[model samples]
Target: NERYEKFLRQHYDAKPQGRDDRYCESMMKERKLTSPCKDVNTFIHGTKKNIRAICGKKGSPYGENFRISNSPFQITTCTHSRGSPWPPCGYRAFKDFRYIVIACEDGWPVHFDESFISP
Candidate 1:
């Protein structure tokens, strides 16, 4: 679905150094993720192939549909810090390099779910 495609571009960053206000605001507009403030979002600084690889990794599962990444990923997180829940939303960027949560279907990521720093 388009959500998965959108997920890829919005959440996957090949070299997530960090995000500036311009980056967050512009990306939100370009990706059509600004109907409302996204509140919180994350980007994995890794290749698509590696991110996609988690779908096939061995793990118990997050309710049988989602899987935890076998490896920690360098990540950038953008969180709303001010403004209303509408366009021109504000965000504060940070980082997280850890296992991420994912849901897959037919060998592809269908949902980004969430992420964690636990083993």
Candidate 2:
């Protein structure tokens, strides 16, 4: 497993300089992933639901860390059909969606996933 991890490091590392993968921007912007936190003193934190809360084009009932009380989080909607992956009617996030959520003790934002409760 270490070898695989090392491989990931080397493979993912930029081409010795500013050079990086061709799809790096598109892929990163698409998924909204954050650069790996490197500062030793600085800390990074968050949860899956947090990401869904901030970036989710559709609202959900599981705000942050699956907390059962705060239901119905806001969603970012797009009028352009090509802008969002969802149909004309907004819904939930894609299963493959990925992103980084900064530290929030409340766990993140609402995520209308299986653990979410619709109001």
Candidate 3:
């Protein structure tokens, strides 16, 4: 699947790094996620199957909004660090177990939203 391949390259940063304050800033740039500097983004720490299996899970929302899924996942999300600007932008890290809600169009994920489910 080309989509999955592209997703692996763009969304997953497999390089080794110290899970410290500089992780996001370095990764976002290393992975080119900061080319245009995305405001909010997700990076799944689990395997590709686990990430893609999210689509097959029962009752996951598809298209243009966030909805809690019956099954939740532990993941990290990144955003611009406060007071930081582009180019040398820093990123804030957050960890949570939200039931990964996303919107799909043309059979691919186009949007990611927060879920309301609990573990």
Candidate 4:
């Protein structure tokens, strides 16, 4: 339960403007999500309620371990750019609208899985 709540704020933000290196740095600093770095991460640009709706029922086509959204969502993908393993972690932000995938349990998203283009 605690981890699920943390996952919410870590991956979904209601309002995200200027998703840049500075932003990622602050996020990592605050979240300390992973060791050294997060490598890659995507933020869902929507209310927490809407984001949660992506969780599909059991025996979903995508399988039980994962759930995908019915439609593409506005998002910001941040990736490692430079800086050797640190609080100095530099990141490059990509603005996009793509389908999202996550691992959900008990109606809460626990993991930010994968995403892809509309094609």
Candidate 2, which ten residues in sequence have the lowest lDDT sum?
37-46
Judged by lDDT against the true structure, how good is candidate 1? 0.70
Ten-residue region with minimum lDDT total, candidate 3: 110-119
Listed in order, each prediction's TM-score against the native is 0.80, 0.17, 0.67, 0.80
Q: Is candidate 3 or candidate 4 better by lDDT?
A: 4
Deviation of model 4 at 56, angstroms = 4.4
Query: So what's the TM-score on candidate 3?
Result: 0.67
lDDT of each: 0.70, 0.26, 0.59, 0.71
lDDT of 3 by residue, 1-119 (tens): 56555565556654335544577777678678776676766665655555555555544654545333456666666777656465777787766656666544455544455332223
Q: How good is model 1 by TM-score?
A: 0.80
| Per-structure clash totals for the candidates | 0, 6, 2, 0
For model 2, state the Cα shift of residue 89 in Å: 22
Between candidates 1 and 2, name the one with more favorable lDDT: 1
Task: Write down the TM-score for model 2.
Answer: 0.17
Q: How well does candidate 3 match the true structure, expressed as C-alpha RMSD?
A: 4.0
Number of residue pairs clashing in candidate 3, backbone atoms closer than 3 angstroms, sequence gap of 3 or more or interchain: 2
Number of the top-ranking candidate, with lDDT as the measure: 4
In candidate 2, stretches whose alpha carbon ends up further than 4 angstroms from where it belongs are 1-31, 34-65, 77-119
When 1 and 3 are scored with lDDT, the better candidate is: 1
Q: On a 0 to 1 TM-score scale, where does candidate 4 land against the true structure?
A: 0.80
Model 1 residue 35 lDDT score: 70
